[PDB]
């Protein structure tokens, strides 16, 4: 499938604990991300990234990247937060 050396470290908070994701990079976008976490930890289905700021929360799209989106800010870039919500339950696995 697909693969990259090199990669960058995603902050999004999962399960109440900061999750670190390994191979995300600018071209890498949201869908790919939100995917990936939910894969890694386990179960999987329809998740969602939003970003936290000064108490604002905002849901972002699955074609826009999540580097991207916070690299908007700059400066105050990495006082915004990740928390991978779901938007939808699980279904059958593992037949």
């Given amino acids: 499938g697909s693969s990259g050396s090199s990669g960058m470290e ?3 908070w999962v399960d109440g604990v900061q999750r670190i994701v390994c191979g995300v990079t600018e071209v890498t976008t949201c869908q790919e991300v939100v995917i990936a976490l939910a894969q890694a930890i386990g179960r999987t289905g329809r998740y969602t990234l939003i970003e936290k700021w000064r108490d604002t929360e905002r849901h972002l799209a699955p074609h826009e990247n999540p580097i991207i989106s916070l ?10 937060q990740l928390i991978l919500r779901r938007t939808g339950p699980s279904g059958p696995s593992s037949g």
């Fill in 71 to 80: 690299n908007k800010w700059g400066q105050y870039a990495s006082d915004v």
């Fill in 10 to 12: 995603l902050k999004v």
